[PDB]
Amino acid sequence: FPGVWRKHHPDVDPRYKEWAHFAISSQVENRTNFDTLMTLISVESQVIAGVDYKLKMKVAESTCVIGVDSYSKERCYLKVNVPYMLCTAVVNYMPWEHKTILKSYDCSDRVYGV
Structure with missing residues (x-):
């Protein structure tokens, strides 16, 4: 504000999910x-x-161990029956440099879906 957010269908652009994986995988603190x-x-x-891009997501623990496995969407699939958190990430994309940066990342408690 005075900015306006415009809603997009999450399947409009495959990049939205690439951006989600970028944001989620970048925050490694205390995991x-x-x-x-x-x-x-x-x-x-x-x-x-x-x-x-403001991305609202369910986020949960993958099978990939920090410092052992590199992160990829293909390798790092979900663990079974672990709780999720509701997270909002803001990613900025600069088309003119094909550059992506994480602006912010805010998460609920990790207590849902169980």
């Missing part, structure tokens, strides 16, 4: 395993310098 994307719930965008 033994990477988190991964459970469900991309919604996507909103806003133009400033580049495009800001």
